[PDB]
Amino acid sequence: TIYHAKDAVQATKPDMRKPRLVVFVVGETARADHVSFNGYERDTFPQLAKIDGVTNFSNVTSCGTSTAYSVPCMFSYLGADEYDVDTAKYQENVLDTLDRLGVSILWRDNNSDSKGVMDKLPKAQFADYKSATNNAICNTNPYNECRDVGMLVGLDDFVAANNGKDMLIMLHQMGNHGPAYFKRYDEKFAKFTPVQSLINAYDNALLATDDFIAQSIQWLQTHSNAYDVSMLYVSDHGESLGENGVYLHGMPNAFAPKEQRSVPAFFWTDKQTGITPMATDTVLTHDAITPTLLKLFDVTADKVKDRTAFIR
Ligand SMILES: [Zn+2]
Ligand SMILES: [Zn+2]
């Protein structure tokens, strides 16, 4: 219904330059201040720390404090100041734009769903990875809960099916959603014990996300010969863990504590892509996601031209 980027155009197409392949990990309930890179006293991201090419952003603010509110905003043209959750799904979003310009879009979801973001695109481009019908990694724990790494299975098939095209893959993580954080990770990540126990479980869940992001990057690396590959991670909101008597998330922005809106963001790219990240301490928000995705595929749109991205 409401358009934002009818003028959008891709400056270069994949027939005259290397095609581009991006994984966008849409994170869940992760707090910036529980990231080792941001000064946390526990090493919650030990695998990512060993990977060259990873930029950590230390000053990122979410649009809101819930999945329902934040996720459509992350893909919106409006920005946090203008965003309206009720009317979001009736507006053209950045995936609509990229799809129209020929970028192959895939959304795998181990969270809930895309909160309206994928609704205008063909049903076949969204896939529910919360069920063992699609996810091959579900029986590794007492709860039979499907794991985020299951979303990486068979992604080569998608690349093959779309070979030579630009591709953007969204992987919507279960991540750190609670309150039962101890359910969110398999036993091999139960590092911080006992499961304060609530904090420990929270940090163990971050370890499993560290693992998932690291494996996402490794998967991308295997395609770097044929594709310009990059990985963007941003959490949809943080989490209160008892500060001032506040717990969980979803607090209205007017009263939301810092903990619920201070989120981690990472960017990784292969050396050959020529993509340059912004400074780690750039003042950033969820508003930066749409311009970042457009830039990664060499797309310009009038509405977002003044906007700061995660990359130059
Ligand atoms: Zn939630
Ligand atoms: Zn969420």
Author numbering: 219 to 413, 425 to 541
Question: Any passages from the paper?
Answer:
MCR-1 confers resistance by modifying the colistin target, catalyzing transfer of phosphoethanolamine (PEA) onto the glucosamine saccharide of lipid A in the bacterial outer membrane. Bacterial lipooligosaccharide PEA-transferases such as MCR-1 are organised into two domains: an N-terminal inner membrane-bound domain predicted to contain 5 transmembrane α-helices and a soluble, periplasmic domain containing the putative catalytic centre.
Phases calculated from datasets collected at or near the zinc X-ray absorption edge ultimately yielded structures for two different crystal forms in the space groups P41212 (1.75 Å resolution) and P21 (1.55 Å resolution). However, the two crystal forms differ in zinc content, with the P21 structure containing one zinc ion (Zn1), coordinated by Asp465, His466, Glu246 and Thr285 in a tetrahedral geometry, while the P41212 structure contains density for an additional, also tetrahedral, zinc site (Zn2) coordinated by His395, His478, a water molecule (Wat1) and Glu300 from a symmetry related molecule. Whilst our structures unambiguously identify a zinc site (Zn1) in MCR-1 adjacent to the essential Thr285, the Zn2 site in the P41212 crystal form involves crystallographic contacts and may not be relevant in solution. This possibility is further supported by another recently released crystal structure of the MCR-1 catalytic domain with phospho-Thr285 (PDB 5K4P20) that was crystallised from conditions of high zinc concentration contains zinc ions in the Zn1 site and at a number of additional positions, of which none is directly equivalent to the Zn2 site identified here. However, less complete conservation is evident when comparing the putative Zn2 sites- while the Zn2 ligands His395 and His478, and the adjacent Glu468, are also well conserved between MCR-1, LptA and EptC, these positions vary in less closely related family members such as choline sulphatase suggesting that an intact Zn2 site is not a prerequisite for activity in all such enzymes.
